[PDB]
Write an enzyme that holds these catalytic residues in place. Sequence first.
Site, PDB file in Angstrom:
ATOM      1  N   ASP A  98       0.951  -1.244  -0.037  1.00 54.98           N
ATOM      2  CA  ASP A  98      -0.075   0.199   0.166  1.00 54.98           C
ATOM      3  C   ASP A  98       0.995   1.251  -0.028  1.00 54.98           C
ATOM      4  O   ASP A  98       1.721   1.543   0.907  1.00 54.98           O
ATOM      5  CB  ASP A  98      -0.842  -0.011   0.989  1.00 54.98           C
ATOM      6  CG  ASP A  98      -2.192   1.056   1.127  1.00 54.98           C
ATOM      7  OD1 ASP A  98      -1.899   2.059   0.455  1.00 54.98           O
ATOM      8  OD2 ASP A  98      -3.431   0.645   1.158  1.00 54.98           O
ATOM      9  N   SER A 101      -7.160   4.196  -1.381  1.00 54.53           N
ATOM     10  CA  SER A 101      -6.693   2.803  -1.360  1.00 54.53           C
ATOM     11  C   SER A 101      -8.180   2.159  -1.509  1.00 54.53           C
ATOM     12  O   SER A 101      -8.185   1.042  -2.004  1.00 54.53           O
ATOM     13  CB  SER A 101      -6.533   2.500   0.118  1.00 54.53           C
ATOM     14  OG  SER A 101      -5.121   2.938   0.338  1.00 54.53           O
ATOM     15  N   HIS A 134      -9.787  -2.798   6.832  1.00 56.67           N
ATOM     16  CA  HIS A 134      -9.399  -1.751   5.919  1.00 56.67           C
ATOM     17  C   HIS A 134      -9.405  -1.621   4.496  1.00 56.67           C
ATOM     18  O   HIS A 134      -9.829  -2.968   4.054  1.00 56.67           O
ATOM     19  CB  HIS A 134      -7.969  -1.445   6.487  1.00 56.67           C
ATOM     20  CG  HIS A 134      -7.456  -0.051   6.505  1.00 56.67           C
ATOM     21  ND1 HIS A 134      -6.185   0.373   5.683  1.00 56.67           N
ATOM     22  CD2 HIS A 134      -7.933   0.944   6.834  1.00 56.67           C
ATOM     23  CE1 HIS A 134      -6.120   1.601   6.124  1.00 56.67           C
ATOM     24  NE2 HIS A 134      -6.931   2.214   6.665  1.00 56.67           N
ATOM     25  N   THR A 179      -8.019  -2.124   1.727  1.00 58.90           N
ATOM     26  CA  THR A 179      -7.347  -3.026   1.113  1.00 58.90           C
ATOM     27  C   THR A 179      -7.832  -4.313   1.137  1.00 58.90           C
ATOM     28  O   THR A 179      -8.388  -5.140   0.112  1.00 58.90           O
ATOM     29  CB  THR A 179      -5.965  -3.127   1.063  1.00 58.90           C
ATOM     30  OG1 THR A 179      -5.322  -1.761   1.023  1.00 58.90           O
ATOM     31  CG2 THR A 179      -4.984  -3.873   0.325  1.00 58.90           C
ATOM     32  N   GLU A 189      -1.152  -7.972   2.247  1.00 55.14           N
ATOM     33  CA  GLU A 189      -0.881  -6.680   1.845  1.00 55.14           C
ATOM     34  C   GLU A 189       0.061  -6.184   3.276  1.00 55.14           C
ATOM     35  O   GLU A 189       0.035  -6.450   4.253  1.00 55.14           O
ATOM     36  CB  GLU A 189      -2.361  -5.994   2.424  1.00 55.14           C
ATOM     37  CG  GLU A 189      -1.789  -4.404   2.501  1.00 55.14           C
ATOM     38  CD  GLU A 189      -3.009  -3.665   2.722  1.00 55.14           C
ATOM     39  OE1 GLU A 189      -3.996  -3.877   3.632  1.00 55.14           O
ATOM     40  OE2 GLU A 189      -2.975  -2.382   2.466  1.00 55.14           O
ATOM     41  N   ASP A 225       1.967   2.653   3.468  1.00 49.94           N
ATOM     42  CA  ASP A 225       1.096   3.733   3.340  1.00 49.94           C
ATOM     43  C   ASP A 225       1.224   4.750   4.481  1.00 49.94           C
ATOM     44  O   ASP A 225       1.367   5.922   4.453  1.00 49.94           O
ATOM     45  CB  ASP A 225      -0.241   3.570   2.828  1.00 49.94           C
ATOM     46  CG  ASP A 225      -1.012   4.548   2.581  1.00 49.94           C
ATOM     47  OD1 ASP A 225      -0.276   5.358   1.566  1.00 49.94           O
ATOM     48  OD2 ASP A 225      -2.226   4.654   2.925  1.00 49.94           O
ATOM     49  N   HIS A 240       2.297   8.798   4.626  1.00 55.82           N
ATOM     50  CA  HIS A 240       1.442   9.735   5.363  1.00 55.82           C
ATOM     51  C   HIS A 240       1.933  10.753   6.241  1.00 55.82           C
ATOM     52  O   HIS A 240       1.816  12.013   6.350  1.00 55.82           O
ATOM     53  CB  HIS A 240       0.128   8.940   5.740  1.00 55.82           C
ATOM     54  CG  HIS A 240      -0.797   8.684   4.753  1.00 55.82           C
ATOM     55  ND1 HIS A 240      -0.994   9.634   3.681  1.00 55.82           N
ATOM     56  CD2 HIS A 240      -1.449   7.532   4.308  1.00 55.82           C
ATOM     57  CE1 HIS A 240      -1.897   8.786   2.904  1.00 55.82           C
ATOM     58  NE2 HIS A 240      -2.093   7.834   3.249  1.00 55.82           N
ATOM     59  N   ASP A 289      -1.185  -0.155  -4.670  1.00 55.08           N
ATOM     60  CA  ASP A 289      -2.640   0.263  -5.128  1.00 55.08           C
ATOM     61  C   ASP A 289      -2.099   1.666  -6.010  1.00 55.08           C
ATOM     62  O   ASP A 289      -3.056   2.021  -6.559  1.00 55.08           O
ATOM     63  CB  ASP A 289      -3.673   0.338  -4.019  1.00 55.08           C
ATOM     64  CG  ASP A 289      -3.039   1.054  -2.489  1.00 55.08           C
ATOM     65  OD1 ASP A 289      -1.500   1.175  -2.743  1.00 55.08           O
ATOM     66  OD2 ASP A 289      -3.707   1.288  -1.749  1.00 55.08           O
TER      67      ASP A 289
HETATM   68 MG   LIG Z   1      -4.081  -0.714   2.608  1.00 52.82          MG
HETATM   69 ZN   LIG Z   2      -3.420   2.817  -0.561  1.00 48.90          ZN
HETATM   70 ZN   LIG Z   3      -3.143   6.357   2.086  1.00 50.02          ZN
END
Ligand SMILES: [Mg+2]
Ligand SMILES: [Zn+2]
Ligand SMILES: [Zn+2]
Lengths: 476, 476
Positions: free
Chosen positions: B37, B86, B149, B151, B310, B315, B319, B356
């Site tokens: 991700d 996502s 979540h 994903t 995943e 990710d 962030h 993704d």
């Molecule tokens: Mg994800």
């Molecule tokens: Zn994502």
């Molecule tokens: Zn994100």
Amino acid sequence: EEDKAYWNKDAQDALDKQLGIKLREKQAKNVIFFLGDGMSLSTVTAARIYKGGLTGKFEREKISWEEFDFAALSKTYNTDKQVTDSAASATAYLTGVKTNQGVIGLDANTVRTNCSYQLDESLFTYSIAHWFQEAGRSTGVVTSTRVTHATPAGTYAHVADRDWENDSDVVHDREDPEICDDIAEQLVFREPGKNFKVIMGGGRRGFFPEEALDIEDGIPGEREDGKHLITDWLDDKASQGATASYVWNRDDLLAVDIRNTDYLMGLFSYTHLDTVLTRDAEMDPTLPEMTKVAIEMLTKDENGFFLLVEGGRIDHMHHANQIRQSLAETLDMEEAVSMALSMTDPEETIILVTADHGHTLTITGYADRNTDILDFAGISDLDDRRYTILDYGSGPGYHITEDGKRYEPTEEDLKDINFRYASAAPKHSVTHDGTDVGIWVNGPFAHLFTGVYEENYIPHALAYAACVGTGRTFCD
Amino acid sequence: EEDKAYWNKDAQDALDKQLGIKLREKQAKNVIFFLGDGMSLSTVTAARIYKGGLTGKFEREKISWEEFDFAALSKTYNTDKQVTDSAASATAYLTGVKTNQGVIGLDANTVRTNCSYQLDESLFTYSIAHWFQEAGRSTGVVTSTRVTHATPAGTYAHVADRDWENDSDVVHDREDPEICDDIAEQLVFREPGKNFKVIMGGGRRGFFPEEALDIEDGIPGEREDGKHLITDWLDDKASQGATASYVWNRDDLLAVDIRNTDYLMGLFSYTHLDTVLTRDAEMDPTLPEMTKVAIEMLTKDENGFFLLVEGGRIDHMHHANQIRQSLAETLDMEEAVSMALSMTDPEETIILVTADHGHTLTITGYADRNTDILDFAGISDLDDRRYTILDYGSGPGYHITEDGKRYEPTEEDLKDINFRYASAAPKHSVTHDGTDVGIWVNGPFAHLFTGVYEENYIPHALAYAACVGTGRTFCD
Ligand SMILES: [Mg+2]
Ligand SMILES: [Zn+2]
Ligand SMILES: [Zn+2]
Ligand SMILES: *[C@@H]1O[C@H](CO)[C@@H](O)[C@H](O)[C@H]1NC(C)=O
Ligand SMILES: *[C@@H]1O[C@H](CO)[C@@H](O)[C@H](O)[C@H]1NC(C)=O
Ligand SMILES: [Mg+2]
Ligand SMILES: [Zn+2]
Ligand SMILES: [Zn+2]
């Protein structure tokens, strides 16, 4: 609209296309190598959306070379730096060997700026153009930069510093111009350069002396050794019994007699060619117009040809964080690939597009579909000031205002072709980016490009398919 | 050293390896799909150099999935935004249809946050896990994030807003929980989720009510409708005559009786699992450990299986511009691919790795070969302050000091696992990046991934090779 049935038919069709791929396991006669200098994957994506803005397709637009079935990734680190410059990378993707920063056509033994290493033949790496010539085939180069710049230089020169475009540059580094051959000399007096059928781009300045004045502008030349290399080049061809032409503007290029012209030197600027958004369209041929004439000349050789075309100012525009200009440069190159596709036969011509290294361009969120890629993306939840979709990790775009806030780009800024989009780390010239870059290939043996490769793999694969050089070969 | 002969042997071997590729034109029994991700191409390069720093190979190191012969590029724009979240991406790469920001498993007719749309079966998109189920084959999911979540949710859920992980989220949006099924509900009560053989990751909180307390931590749950979904899941399994296990820590997972266990739910945290650099290795199983047990379970199905794994907190770290943690998350996923490769048969198992969407990470110059990717790169010629090799186009890393200068990262900063590397455009949470991402594949029909594809192509191609779904198929 873009609903479930829409995407499903979109996927099934791409699937059909992929299941219909026919491998080309036949020798390559011709190889046309496009090089976007500084053209990161993010540049390609942003250029795709930039193109879509012109055509009305937007994010659904496609870049011409993305219609190829084969793409690959290329690792660009060199022998001494994680983030390569344009010289060491050219040495990798044109001669098959990685090398040190600033060095062209010599191996990593070289110490940059020390002319002695360019006198040692054992350290020489040889270009794919050299290989084509050894095989009795034609070679050429077209670029938007000076023809002596690193990228084109990679097809013919061996220098310990890429800055040594002309003798004034060698002298500036306290080296001996009498024995340290500059790149412009090498193009005209040594192989493979002296055998190129076609030489187009900028850089007239490196080819005539301070005492002489430029055609067109009347700017004194940079040479300090009195040599008039263009006339040397013309005499050499004449003494070989060939017909040669020297042109310096668009009308004259377009008027070239293709069937009767053996050698063509087209130098369209004292220095690098003007950028797409500033050039005089009457006086300057576009990248596709040069590409066309080049192919027209080189394809007279029934045994085949190698041509390098460089979209070279992509890099220069990114260095200044001038993203609008960089994208326009990119599309000039995208149109040249389409020019090449339309004029050659894929059963016999490999068209390869790649970059020498990236730039620190990023595409931020979260603008709606169809938004101009060069527009604002939204407003920051930290300082309440606008930020653009596009921005950079490095460059002069970084700006703290007089009162110590983050510069807020304005609508006037965005339209200004000289406006520098923000960066994260200030620097006078943005650095290149060390991320892997793309490779896209069509034609014979395009399937030698499927995975992830060292950047120097490229020409070795190209030689196999074309049957040139001293490595493993299809004809072998 | 890395001299001319060195690089030439390097390229000839890579060329030999390429000419030795054998195509796999046989059905896929198994599909293992790794999803990094926010794992941009720059993240992969940086993680490659990071790995090398641990192994002593540095820039020459290789990421496990980079040993695959097939890589491709993926275009991630969605139906309303250039830079996808996502949720819409997961809908694309797991169900084969692109969709609107924030939407899962419904098509672009959907208006985000309007539950009514998740009631209309005609707008449903179906996941590759659904297709494996319909074909009588097993399915599972492993992640470092909550199992609700976006994903993981893409493999099973149909919601109008990805925030609707539990009923309290639905209520917060003024929608009716009685008829608006949240993601945790859908996993336990609807297909394909109710049929998954394996479910691992975090997010216990979405599965039990405020009145009840978490195993391990005693934190009250988030559910407001009194449902105890884990016991509902266990009771469903038992009433089918199957054996089931619920585990919440590493020792207990490792102790699971593989041969006698039909169903496994492993929820290792109240929320997302702790990051690689902060987790308690005694209590939390690593991404590779989960992957191993998952495959152990699912391979009991002699007809095959689909597994999503995943690497999800890549990710979350990006962030916060926490690059050091992002890279450690990435390598945890890299080691899981190696685990999967070491346990399954490539003549029958596709392993696909992709992202993704990316993040705005860039790799600036110009540090020497072997410099720690997380180190300084040099000093700015504009403000005479240090800058790091890695940085971002977006995020909380942007910092103007009290006296109105550019924050200068220190050596202490660089070692602090919570230090936010600099960004160009301040934002509390960095935006995702719109640039194309990679795909790398191995196993049957890996050669269906060679060029550049819309992100939703992926599962259509995978279905073809696996012979599932209603589109074109290898068995057809
Ligand atoms: Mg994800
Ligand atoms: Zn994502
Ligand atoms: Zn994100
Ligand atoms: C340049 O290289 C030569 C050749 O070996 C060496 O003798 C000389 O001192 C080098 N120059 C410098 C400045 O290091
Ligand atoms: C939500 O969708 C329904 C179903 O068509 C519609 O009647 C309702 O007004 C919509 N709500 C909003 C906020 O638009
Ligand atoms: Mg260049
Ligand atoms: Zn370059
Ligand atoms: Zn540059």
